[PDB]
């Protein structure tokens, strides 16, 4: 598992181009540390956990430690 730090606030309800993003993409504020498992997928998203919840994370919003 790798840690990424959020560089931006992200609210998938209002900011995701995916109409399903609200249930499947993780919500985060700047400075949040995300548990990412595996590698970036073909779509550009990581798989991870934050505050006990799992979902997808856009790579252009986070930076690997």
């Amino acid at each position: 598992f790798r840690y990424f730090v959020a560089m931006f606030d992200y609210d998938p309800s209002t900011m995701s181009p995916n109409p399903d993003g609200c249930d499947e993409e993780l919500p985060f504020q700047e400075g949040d540390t995300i548990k990412v498992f595996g590698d970036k997928d073909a779509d550009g998203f990581y798989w991870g956990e934050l505050r006990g919840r799992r979902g997808y994370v856009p790579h252009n919003m986070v930076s690997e430690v």
Partner: peptide, 12 residues
Amino acid sequence: GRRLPPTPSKPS
């Protein structure tokens, strides 16, 4: 397939 949100303005 799954789409990325736009990369915004500036880092912090």
